[PDB]
Design a protein around this ligand. Structure first.
Ligand SMILES: Nc1ncnc2c1ncn2[C@@H]1O[C@H](COP(=O)(O)OP(=O)(O)OP(=O)(O)O)[C@@H](O)[C@H]1O
Ligand SMILES: [Mg+2]
Length: 224
C-alpha cells in the first residue's frame, strides 16, 4: 500500500501551565479528506487547530503535518480595502475568484453594490452584515491555494438555509479534493464527513466515521 496521510496527532497533550486544554488526542487525516470537529463551547476545538498551526505546542505526543495552511478564524477580521482585495490578497486568478464568490454566495451581494467587488471597506467591515463578513472571511480562506484548510465555525452567523447551501457548494463541492478540517455544530455536516472528532473538556469523546457514530448518545443532543 501507498500512504497519503496528511495530518497525524499521536498521544497529544498540551497546556495553554496548570490543567490541559487537550489531553491524549489521537487522529489521522488523509489527503482530500474532510474531518468534522465537534463539541461544546470550550472543549478545545480551536486549540486543536492552533496545535496544527504551531501556535500551541504539545507537552506529550507528536503532531505530523507538512503543508501550507489556510485558516478561517472565528470572529475573522475584515481589513481596509475592497471586498475583492479582502478575498484575493496578493494573487490574481479570475477563474478561481469567480468560483469562490459563487460557492460562498457573494455574487448577489457584490452585484447589488454600485462599484461591485471594488467597494472599499474600513477596518472591521462595520458597514457589512454579519453574514457578509462571515462569507468574505470564508471566501478568503477557500481562495488561498493551501494544502490544509482549517475552517473554524465559518457558518455561525449564517441563517440555516444559507449555511446548508454553502456547506454543499463550498465545503463539499468546490473543496472536494482538499484536506479540510471543519469545526461545526451540525449533524448534517457530520454525515457528509470522512471522519469525525468530538471533543469534550479537552479530550476525545468520539473519533471515527458517521456509521460508527450512528452505531452509538451525547452527540445526538449536542448537534443541530
Ligand atoms: N490563546 C489562548 N491562551 C490561553 N487560553 C486559551 C487560548 N485559546 C483558548 N484558550 C482556553 O482554552 C479553552 C479551550 O478554548 P478553545 O478556543 O479551544 O475552545 P473551543 O472548543 O474552540 O470553543 P468555542 O466553541 O466556544 O469556540 C478555553 O477555556 C479557553 O479560554
Ligand atoms: Mg472555538
Amino acid at each position: 500500500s501507498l500512504t497519503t496521510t496528511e495530518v497525524v496527532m499521536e498521544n497529544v497533550t498540551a497546556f495553554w501551565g496548570g490543567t490541559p486544554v487537550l489531553k491524549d488526542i489521537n487522529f489521522k487525516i488523509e489527503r482530500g479528506q474532510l474531518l468534522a470537529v465537534a463539541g461544546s463551547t470550550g472543549a478545545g476545538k480551536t486549540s486543536l487547530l492552533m496545535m496544527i498551526m504551531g501556535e500551541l505546542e504539545p507537552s506529550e505526543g507528536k503532531i505530523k503535518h507538512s503543508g501550507r495552511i489556510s485558516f478561517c478564524s472565528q470572529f475573522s477580521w475584515i481589513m481596509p480595502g475592497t471586498i475583492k482585495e479582502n478575498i484575493i490578497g496578493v494573487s490574481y486568478d479570475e477563474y478561481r475568484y469567480r468560483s469562490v464568490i459563487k460557492a460562498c454566495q457573494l455574487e448577489e451581494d457584490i452585484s447589488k453594490f454600485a462599484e461591485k467587488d471594488n467597494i472599499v471597506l474600513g477596518e472591521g467591515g462595520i458597514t457589512l452584515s454579519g453574514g457578509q463578513r462571515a462569507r468574505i472571511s470564508l471566501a478568503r480562506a477557500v481562495y488561498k491555494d493551501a494544502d490544509l484548510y482549517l475552517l473554524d465555525s465559518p457558518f455561525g452567523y449564517l441563517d440555516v438555509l444559507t449555511e446548508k447551501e454553502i456547506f454543499e457548494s463550498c465545503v463539499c463541492k468546490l473543496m472536494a479534493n482538499k484536506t479540510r478540517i471543519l469545526v461545526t455544530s451540525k449533524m448534517e455536516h457530520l454525515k457528509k464527513a470522512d471522519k469525525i472528532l468530538i471533543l469534550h473538556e479537552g479530550s476525545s469523546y468520539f473519533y471515527g466515521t458517521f456509521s460508527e457514530l450512528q452505531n452509538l448518545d451525547f452527540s445526538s443532543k449536542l448537534m443541530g
